[PDB]
């Protein structure tokens, strides 16, 4: 409930009823770490 | 990896030649979610979209040359390393000074030609490789032999030890394609709300676009190199401003953007990319709130407001209203919400008990910030809370913001009410003492009732128990009284098994006796109310929580507040002028202070004292009366009652206004109170020194104009002191935690049974530190007390009970074996039995727990406590002569004994310590011994209280003979070595031996030596060793006695004068501790002995750093380097052992560690670190300081050769595991030792195994590029990387999952 | 002082360097301190003079200077303050070939000559000068003023 808007919105689905349990994936703000370095002229891509 | 033309083009969607919605069509007739799977006519456009914009890097932009910056301009180079270049040329083309190069170019003719632009980095790597340096670079070295032959063979092995992770091409350094950020991450900051002025992130990226066309068009239209190369300079000017903005001058100078805003300034604007990334910020269901008080509420409660609670807890509010059937759906409720309703309140009274609240201050540093509380219903805006917990955070409620956190889900809700609450956390994680300790209105009220009161209405009417409190509440009979006996029904759990023991009548006061029935069974009762609760209120709750447990001890502490406040009001004291009484003799001690100074001030005008000491004598004489006026105050205040108690004429303790603030212990101190009262505190000049004269009047009385100037001169310092320290502590809080970071409990237990011994410091005089506080919660390995039986067990616990067992019985045993964080088998994380057990509820909390963060935070807040230490004679009587205050008997350790002429014992050896032992067994007073010591009484002989033990002339450092005989002046010629010097008044022609520097160019080998020889002819031998009784005299030595004098076994031969004398330096709180954290070498560093054996002296005083000694007998005769400036503490002709103080100065960490061992330096840190805060008044426990050190001691230079890299840099976690696996399975010899490389807070924390984490804390200018350049792959399981990329930290419950997962 | 050099998108940046290209050819010192490339609009730091204007007239023709007048950039008060001063000066007498100052619609802050004078329809087809050219539009006797 901050960096992910959509992480809030798939949890807006999960909270109200009382089902619970978590799934994040990737934390969005840290793609700006990756991207600003990508634009710096360095290579970053999620391989493996 | 890095980025070259092809691979950036895979991010690049179709060129940006010029800088100039979701589910709809262009023209806007296929608006909304209508139709969708259809194409529009005019535009040829779909409705069906998706969400990618951020992922896609729009721009291409192909420059006719290149640039980059990280690789052009940064303190450790890459283009400079791969080519063999400086940065200065890669700066100016496309070590000496500028004018030196221009003159060197002017001298070395032509030559020259000229270099080139950016292509002279681009084309360079078109014949450059990685996996191919390894057959070439050392063939140049192989020409001028040898060494490097093996360096390739090692690096060949290093490459052959892959091929999983590898080093990638240096063509990726340089950008034929210049990449740009995506659309969404660069928006216009609006000025009004629709005009959209130039952004902080596109002006320079308009320039990247501007740069490519200008060259691509003038190559077409033909332009000169004056117009072409300058465009390549101007290609570098912004493409070198675009990715970095540092070290040069570029772009717009303060119009809309203040700096310039680069990708370097977006990753490193101030201190990394925490704010956006790591920190996440802001959050859903968040609140900021102010202040109240809260008495009617509980300590396990939270007095929330009306309005803010509804706004935050929305999703469940409706979640109720919808599904139950209160509101029709989600929606008829909105109209009811928009208008505010009475029914809503009633429904939400139910959830408040089921869902807690997590609350904090604006600054939090400890584990006392995020303490959480159960919400309770209140109809008042400002948030009510407990009064105890305010002391834990440390706020005096005068504008302190209290932020709110969210207690949602079910899984997250567990950790609130189970881990860190008020309902849970009570006792200290850091200290052994309580944190739940009151201040002001609590403390006071209790004493205000519990006091030896003067008479009162009553005299003494006896009462049973239940009848008590009331009769004294009812009428006539006050609440205080003093002296009433009671049938107090007490209980004492003796011999293990519930409430044993019976009733008793005991003497107390009466406010005391009122309380002693609330009593739920346990404590001493009445024994403890007697005397006072001064620091004992905290110490009582200690003994509550130490004896009883968790179930009963909550009941005890609660009342201390609620009733202790009720006790504060009922007294109803005062803040008046007449409440406090200054001594009537003002014109006496002040005029005495005036006259005593005026006596010296006449010695100024006339001439009797010296100008420098004149200030000091005037100050000391003024300052003598300052303590006298303060003492005259304290005596004419405290012990002044005079009242008649039935039989008349009796003295009591005066219980007036501020006494019962101070005695009780509300806050602060007595030196504070004195100001209001008598003498004003003296504030120094801006430099540091103090003027002759002081202030003479009182804060209470009428004062003067120019008396307030000097107080503001210092008040300004004190304000900046209180303000700027928030920064330094804020750094120091971070720094320590930013060394620890990932160092935590895992696994079970330590296998090895070795550790560091526990003693007291035993500092100089009286007991500064006892044994009792040290052992608290520290596991035993073997530990043998008594004379060889059992006592202490192999794994059992040193909690609270076995302490009083080992501390009331068997007091003679001072030294006991104890474990440590270093002293374990498993190296990744650390083993549980090693540490200690300092915590809250039950002793020893669960497996898998933080530790490293406990210490670093619990040193975080006391980083505010220290104050840099605020501006903080050589008399031959009390200091040269050692004096003992108490009755006992002397005991020594490591000493050799000889009998004198008269009948005395004399000290010769160096490493010697006094240790007094009394009737019980423990050590009280113990002074460190300087050179030359005649004792009055030896070992075994009894010593009474108030006695002089050893006496000396401090001006001299004497030389004493061991065996009787005659003095023979061997190699003693007058002129070369000795000149006959007559003294001033007495006229003793004392033979003065001069220095080695003053002696002739030839006369160097001649040494002054006195040979002890008997009458019979043959030389005197020492009774023991092979060597004869012969001594050597140093330079500047005043020898009194001449040739042919009888000297027995124990007399003064020669007078070695004083060595500097009186080095008053003062140690800092915050600044030295910071210097100790970072671990700096001493400003005047001492020389220390290398290896065990006989030290000598050798070589001559010519040119260089004089005197070059070979010392250390047998093998290892290493010739050392001495600097001259110092006085030789260590005599040369001596067995100067491993770790001996050779010269005057402080302790250098590098020579304490690399020469000595484990047990030594850790103490020299810990003890001195234990000194710095403890000198002012901080409990810096043994377990938690060492956490600093036990993490630092890891990096090591490799010793032996094998699979490890010979003498390179490796951690403890690689080293120990590698050694261990080699022993009895794999390979014996390759079993290589590791010599220690031990650093400070900065340099050690640099080594992260994580490449996500390193690329955040450090200069991200370098490290994000470093993790990229080195092709480093994360694959870690620590606390650093998981906070960042949205992965799970092993923390608390996490550990239980991480034990099953990994 | 700051003068806005209007240039043409695509070669708008080209003009900003074409400043600095031609600066070195006509060279001495001063005048041009810090050339800003903000982007049809190129903001350029300059104190007023005859030099550099001759240079712009030697290499055109897409756009020139911006502000109030092309000879001397860059003021800020256009024609509304002129429409306040016309009130003290005062006619509804309009004929072919008289200057008919507009101050209503999107043709405000602009002047023009009346082309067609209709008395039956009560309109004045006033030709407002925009883009180095003319724009003929019907504006009421009040929507304009006699110069």
Name the minimum distance, in Å, from the CA of B7 to any CA of chain C: 27
Nearest by CB to residue C14, choosing from B20, B217, B227, is: B217
CA dist B435 and B393 (Å) reads 10
How many contacts, defined by CB atoms under 8 Å, are there between B and C? 38
Burial class (CB in 10 A: 0-12, 13-18, 19+), B229: middle
B686-692: list long-range contacts, CB under 8 Å, 24+ apart.
Answer: B686/B713, B688/B871, B690/B619, B692/B597, B692/B601, B692/B615, B692/B618, B692/B619
**List of chain C residues whose C-beta atoms are within 8 Å of the C-beta of residue B227:** 21
**List of chain A residues whose C-beta atoms are within 8 Å of the C-beta of residue B273:** 32-33
CA B684 distance to own-chain centroid: 29
Chains A and C contact (Cβ–Cβ under 8 Å for 3 or more pairs)? no
Q: Return all residues near B284 (Cβ < 8 A) that are at least 6 apart.
A: A1, A2, A8, B406
Which residue range is the domain that position B903 belongs to?
A: 880-952
CB B79 within 8 A of CB B125: no
Helix (H, G, I), strand (E, B) or coil at B380: coil
CA dist B961 and B963 (Å) reads 6
Percent helix, strand, coil in chain A, to 5, is 40, 0, 60
Measured distance between the N- and C-terminal CA atoms of chain A, rounded to whole angstroms: 28
B contact test, residue of C39, C40, C44, C59 with most B CBs within 10 A: C39
Nearest by CB to residue B19, choosing from C14, C24, C39, is: C39
CA pseudo-torsion sign B641, B644, B646, B650: positive
Position of tokens 């292509």?
Answer: B119
Q: Return all residues near B1264 (Cβ < 8 A) that are at least 6 apart.
A: A33, A37, A42, B267, B1255
**List of chain A residues whose C-beta atoms are within 8 Å of the C-beta of residue B180:** 39
Residue B409 CB neighbour total at 10 angstroms: 16
Nearest by CB to residue B276, choosing from A26, A29, A44, is: A29
Q: Which neighbouring-strand residues pair with B303?
A: B376, B384
| Chains in touch with A (≥3 Cβ pairs < 8 A) | B
CA dist B513 and B529 (Å) reads 9
Q: Which neighbouring-strand residues pair with B978?
A: B974, B993
Is B282 in CB contact (< 8 Å) with chain A? Answer: yes
* Cβ within 8 Å, pair B3-A26: no
Q: At B916, give phi and psi (nearest 5°).
A: -75, 135
Nearest by CB to residue A30, choosing from B277, B283, B316, is: B277
Question: Cis peptide before B163, with omega less than 30 degrees from 0?
Answer: yes
- Describe the crossing of helices B1260-1269 and A31-40 by its angle, rounded to 10 degrees: 80
| Rg (chain A; Cα; Å) | 15
Nearest to B8 by CA among A32, A27, A37: A37
Backbone breaks in chain B after residues (C–N over 2.5 Å): 20, 94, 872
Give the CATH number of the domain where residue B902 resides.
2.40.50.100
Position of tokens 């998108």?
Answer: C9
CB B712 within 8 A of CB B720: no
Nearest by CB to residue B214, choosing from C13, C24, C36, is: C13
* Cβ within 8 Å, pair A3-B1268: no
* Cβ within 8 Å, pair A20-B410: yes
Residue B13 CB neighbour total at 10 angstroms: 11
CA dist B257 and B274 (Å) reads 22
* Cβ within 8 Å, pair B179-A12: no
Buried b (16+ CB within 10 A) or exposed e, B1043-1053: eeeebebbbbb
Please give the DSSP secondary-structure letter assigned to residue B1022.
Answer: P
Q: At B410, give phi and psi (nearest 5°).
A: -120, -40
CA atoms within 13 A on the CB side of B291: 11
Residues B483, B485, B486, B492: what is their CA dihedral angle, to the nearest 10 degrees? Answer: 90
CA dist C35 and C16 (Å) reads 7
CA dist B27 and C111 (Å) reads 35
Name the minimum distance, in Å, from the CA of C36 to any CA of chain B: 7
**List of chain B residues whose C-beta atoms are within 8 Å of the C-beta of residue A24:** 1286
- The tokens describing B449, both together, are 């009732």
Distance of CA B322 to CAs B317, B408, B963, Å?
Answer: 9, 19, 105
Q: Of all helices (H) and strands (E), which one includes residue B734?
A: helix B707-740
CA pseudo-torsion sign B845, B848, B850, B855: positive
Nearest by CB to residue B18, choosing from C9, C34, C36, is: C9
Name the minimum distance, in Å, from the CA of C11 to any CA of chain B: 8
Nearest by CB to residue A33, choosing from B68, B175, B277, is: B277
CB B949 within 8 A of CB B937: yes
| Rg (chain C; Cα; Å) | 20
CB B745 within 8 A of CB B848: yes
Give the CATH number of the domain where residue B695 resides.
1.10.132.30
CA atoms within 13 A on the CB side of B755: 27
**List of chain C residues whose C-beta atoms are within 8 Å of the C-beta of residue B214:** 13-14, 17
Which of 231-270 (B) contact A at CB < 8 A? 243, 263-264, 266-267
Is B586 in CB contact (< 8 Å) with chain C? Answer: no
- The tokens describing B876, both together, are 């031959």
Name the minimum distance, in Å, from the CA of B215 to any CA of chain C: 10
**List of chain A residues whose C-beta atoms are within 8 Å of the C-beta of residue B185:** 32, 35-36
Distance of CA B527 to CAs B435, B519, B520, B630, B935, Å?
Answer: 24, 14, 16, 34, 46
Helix ranges (DSSP H) in B572-610: 586-605
**List of chain B residues whose C-beta atoms are within 8 Å of the C-beta of residue C10:** 17-18, 20, 213
CA dist B1130 and B520 (Å) reads 66
Buried b (16+ CB within 10 A) or exposed e, B195-214: eeebbbbbbbbbbbbbbbbb
Residues B761, B767, B768, B770: what is their CA dihedral angle, to the nearest 10 degrees? Answer: 70
Nearest by CB to residue C39, choosing from B20, B234, B253, is: B20
Position of tokens 């300058």?
Answer: B230
B contact test, residue of A1, A35, A39, A46 with most B CBs within 10 A: A39
**List of chain C residues whose C-beta atoms are within 8 Å of the C-beta of residue B17:** 10
- Describe the crossing of helices B1182-1192 and B707-740 by its angle, rounded to 10 degrees: 60
- Describe the crossing of helices B586-605 and B611-638 by its angle, rounded to 10 degrees: 170
Nearest to C42 by CA among C58, C65, C25: C65
**List of chain B residues whose C-beta atoms are within 8 Å of the C-beta of residue C36:** 252
CA dist B1255 and B352 (Å) reads 43
Please give the DSSP secondary-structure letter assigned to residue B93.
Answer: T
Query: Any idea what the Cα angle at residue C116 is, between residues C115 and C117, rounded to 5°?
Result: 125
Q: Which residue of B has its CA nearest to A44?
A: B1
Give the CATH number of the domain where residue B1247 resides.
1.10.150.390
CA dist B1110 and B1118 (Å) reads 5
Q: Return all residues near A45 (Cβ < 8 A) that are at least 6 apart.
A: none
- The tokens describing B1201, both together, are 């050769």
* Cβ within 8 Å, pair C13-B198: no
* Cβ within 8 Å, pair B411-A22: yes
Is B410 in CB contact (< 8 Å) with chain A? Answer: yes
Burial class (CB in 10 A: 0-12, 13-18, 19+), B1073: buried
- The tokens describing B1117, both together, are 């005769």
Structural method = X-ray
Q: Which residue of B has its CA nearest to A12?
A: B315
């Amino acid at each position: 409930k901050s960096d992910d808007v959509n992480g809030r919105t798939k949890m807006y689905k999960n909270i109200v009823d009382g089902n619970h349990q978590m799934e994040p994936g990737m934390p969005e703000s840290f793609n700006v770490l990756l991207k600003e370095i990508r634009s710096l002229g360095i290579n970053i891509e999620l391989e493996d | 990896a890095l980025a070259s033309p092809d691979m950036i083009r895979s991010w690049s969607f179709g060129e940006v030649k010029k800088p100039e919605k979701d589910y709809e069509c262009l023209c806007g007739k296929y608006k909304r979610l209508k139709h969708r799977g259809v194409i529009c006519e005019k535009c040829g456009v779909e409705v069906t979209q998706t969400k990618v914009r951020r992922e896609r890097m729009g721009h291409i932009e192909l420059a006719s040359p290149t640039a980059h910056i990280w690789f052009l301009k940064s303190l450790p180079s890459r283009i400079g390393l791969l080519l063999d270049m400086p940065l200065r040329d890669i700066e100016r083309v496309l070590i000496l000074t500028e004018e030196q190069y221009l003159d060197a170019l002017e001298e070395f003719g032509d030559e020259f030609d000229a270099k080139m632009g950016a292509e002279a980095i681009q084309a360079l790597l078109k014949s450059m490789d990685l996996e191919q340096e390894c057959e070439q670079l050392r063939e140049e070295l192989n020409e001028t032999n040898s060494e490097t032959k093996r360096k390739k063979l090692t690096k060949r092995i290093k490459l052959l030890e892959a091929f999983v992770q590898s080093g990638n091409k240096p063509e990726w350094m340089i950008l034929t394609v210049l990449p740009v950020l995506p659309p969404d991450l660069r928006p216009l900051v609006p000025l009004d709300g629709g005009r959209f002025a130039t952004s902080d992130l596109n002006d320079l990226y308009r320039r990247v676009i501007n740069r490519n066309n200008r060259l691509k068009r003038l190559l077409d239209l033909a332009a000169p190199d004056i117009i072409v190369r300058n465009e390549k300079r101007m290609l570098q000017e912004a493409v070198d401003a675009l990715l970095d903005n540092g070290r040069r001058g570029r772009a717009i100078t303060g119009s809309n953007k203040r700096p310039l805003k680069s990708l370097a300034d977006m990753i490193k604007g101030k201190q990394g990319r925490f704010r956006q990334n790591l920190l996440g910020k802001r959050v859903d269901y968040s609140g900021r709130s102010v202040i109240t008080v809260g008495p009617y509420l509980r300590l396990h409660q939270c007095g929330l407001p009306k309005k803010m609670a509804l706004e935050l807890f929305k999703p469940f509010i409706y979640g109720k209203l919808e599904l139950r059937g209160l509101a029709t759906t989600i929606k008829a409720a909105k109209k009811m919400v928009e208008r505010e309703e009475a029914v809503v309140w009633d429904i939400l009274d139910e959830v408040i008990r089921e869902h807690p609240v997590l609350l904090n201050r604006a600054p939090t540093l400890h584990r006392l910030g995020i303490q959480a509380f159960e919400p309770v219903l209140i109809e008042g805006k400002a948030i009510q809370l407990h009064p105890l917990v305010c002391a834990a955070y440390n706020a005096d409620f005068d504008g302190d913001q209290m932020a709110v956190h969210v207690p949602l889900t079910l899984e997250a809700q567990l950790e609130a009410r189970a881990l860190m609450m008020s309902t849970n956390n009570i006792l200290s994680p850091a200290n052994g003492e309580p944190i739940i300790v009151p201040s002001q209105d609590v403390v006071l009220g209790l004493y205000y009732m519990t006091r030896d009161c003067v008479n009162a209405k009553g005299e003494g009417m006896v009462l049973t128990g239940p009848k008590e409190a009331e009769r004294l509440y009812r009428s006539g009979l006050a609440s205080l009284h003093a002296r009433v006996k009671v049938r107090i029904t007490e209980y004492e759990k003796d011999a293990n098994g519930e409430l044993v023991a019976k009733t008793s009548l005991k003497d107390t006061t009466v406010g005391r006796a009122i309380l002693w029935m609330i009593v739920p069974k346990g404590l001493p009762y009445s024994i403890v109310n007697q005397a006072l609760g001064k620091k004992a209120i905290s110490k009582m709750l200690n003994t509550c929580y130490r004896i009883l447990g968790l179930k009963p001890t909550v009941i005890f502490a609660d009342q201390i507040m609620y009733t202790g406040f009720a006790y504060a009001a009922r007294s109803g004291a005062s803040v008046g002028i007449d409440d406090m009484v200054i001594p009537e003799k003002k014109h006496e001690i002040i005029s005495e202070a005036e006259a005593e100074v005026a006596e010296i001030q006449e010695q100024f005008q006339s001439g009797l004292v010296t100008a420098g000491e004149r200030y000091n004598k005037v100050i000391d004489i003024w300052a003598a009366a300052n303590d006298r006026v303060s003492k005259a105050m304290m005596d004419n205040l405290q012990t002044e009652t005079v009242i008649n108690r039935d039989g008349q004429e009796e003295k009591q303790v005066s219980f007036n206004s501020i006494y019962m603030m101070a005695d009780s212990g509300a806050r602060g101190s007595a030196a504070q109170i004195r100001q209001l009262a008598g003498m004003r505190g003296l504030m120094a000049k801006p430099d540091g020194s103090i003027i002759e004269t002081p202030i003479t009047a009182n804060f209470r009385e009428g004062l003067n104009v120019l008396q307030y100037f000097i107080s503001t001169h210092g008040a300004r310092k004190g304000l900046a002191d209180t303000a700027l320290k928030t920064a330094n502590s804020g750094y120091l809080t971070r720094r320590l935690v930013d060394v620890a970071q990932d160092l935590v409990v895992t696994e079970d237990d330590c296998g090895t049974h070795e550790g560091i011994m526990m003693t007291p410091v035993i500092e100089g005089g009286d007991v500064k530190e006892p044994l009792r506080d040290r052992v608290l919660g520290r596991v035993t390995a073997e530990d043998v007390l008594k004379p060889g039986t059992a006592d202490i067990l192999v794994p059992r616990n040193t909690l609270l009970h076995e302490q009083w067992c080992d501390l009331l019985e068997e007091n003679s045993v001072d030294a006991v074996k104890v474990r440590s964080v270093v002293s374990c088998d498993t190296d990744f994380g650390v083993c549980a039995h090693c540490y200690g057990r300092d915590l809250a509820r039950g002793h020893i909390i669960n497996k898998g727990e933080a530790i490293g963060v406990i210490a670093a935070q619990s040193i975080g807040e006391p980083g505010t406590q220290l104050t840099m230490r605020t501006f903080h004679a050589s008399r031959a009587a009390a200091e040269s002569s050692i004096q003992v205050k108490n009755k006992g008997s002397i005991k020594l350790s490591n000493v050799k004994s000889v009998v004198n002429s008269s009948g005395k014992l004399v000290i010769t050896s160096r490493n010697t310590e006094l240790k007094l032992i009394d009737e019980f067994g423990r050590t009280k007073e113990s002074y460190k011994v300087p050179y030359g010591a005649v004792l009055a009484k030896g070992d075994g002989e009894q010593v009474a209280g108030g006695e002089t033990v050893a006496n000396w002339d401090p001006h001299t450092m004497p030389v004493i003979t061991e065996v009787s005989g005659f003095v023979r002046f061997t190699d003693m010629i007058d002129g070369q070595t000795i000149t006959r010097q007559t003294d001033e008044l007495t006229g003793l022609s004392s033979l003065v031996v001069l220095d080695s520097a003053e002696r002739t160019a030839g006369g160097k080998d001649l040494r002054p030596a006195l040979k002890i020889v008997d009458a019979q002819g043959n030389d005197v031998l020492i009774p023991g060793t092979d060597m004869p009784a012969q001594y050597f005299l140093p330079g500047k030595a005043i020898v009194q006695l001449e040739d042919g004098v009888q000297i027995s076994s124990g007399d003064t031969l020669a007078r070695i004068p004083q060595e500097s004398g009186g080095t008053k330096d003062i140690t800092g709180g915050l600044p030295r501790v910071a210097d100790l954290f970072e671990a700096r070498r001493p400003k005047e560093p001492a020389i220390l002995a290398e290896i065990s054996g006989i030290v000598s002296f050798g070589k001559e005083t010519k040119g260089k750093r004089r005197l070059v000694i070979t010392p250390v007998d047998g093998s290892d005769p290493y010739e050392e380097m001495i600097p001259k400036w110092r006085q030789l503490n260590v005599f040369e002709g001596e067995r100067v052992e491993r770790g001996d103080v050779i010269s005057d100065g402080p302790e250098a960490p590098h020579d304490i560690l690399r020469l000595r061992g484990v047990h030594a330096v850790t103490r020299y840190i810990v003890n001195e670190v234990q000194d710095v805060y403890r000198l002012q008044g901080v409990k810096i426990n043994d377990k938690h300081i060492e956490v600093i050190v036990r993490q630092m001691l890891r990096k090591a230079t490799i010793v032996n050769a094998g699979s490890s890299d010979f003498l390179e840099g490796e951690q403890v976690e690689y080293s120990r595991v590698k050694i261990a696996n080699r022993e009895l399975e794999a390979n014996g010899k390759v079993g290589a030792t590791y010599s220690r490389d031990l650093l400070g807070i900065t340099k050690a924390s640099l080594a992260t195994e994580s490449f996500i984490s390193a690329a955040s804390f450090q200069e991200t200018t370098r490290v994000l590029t470093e993790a990229a350049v080195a092709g480093k792959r994360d694959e870690l399981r620590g606390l650093k990387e998981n906070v960042i990329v949205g992965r799970l930290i092993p923390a608390g419950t996490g550990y239980a999952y991480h034990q099953d997962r990994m | 002082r700051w003068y806005v050099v209007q240039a043409f998108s695509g070669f708008e940046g080209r003009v900003a360097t074409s400043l600095r290209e031609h600066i070195k050819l006509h060279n001495m010192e001063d005048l041009f301190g810090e050339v800003m490339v903000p982007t049809g609009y190129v903001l350029v730091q300059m104190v007023m003079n005859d030099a550099s204007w001759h240079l712009v007239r030697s290499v055109p023709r897409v756009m020139g200077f911006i502000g109030g007048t092309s000879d001397r950039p860059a003021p800020i008060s256009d024609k509304e303050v002129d429409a306040i001063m016309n009130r003290l000066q005062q006619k509804t007498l309009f004929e072919p070939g008289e200057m008919v100052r507009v101050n209503d619609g999107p043709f405000a802050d602009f002047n023009g000559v009346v082309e067609e004078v209709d008395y039956e329809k009560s309109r004045l087809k006033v030709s407002v000068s925009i883009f180095g050219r003319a724009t003929p539009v019907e504006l009421d006797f009040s929507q304009v003023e006699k110069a």
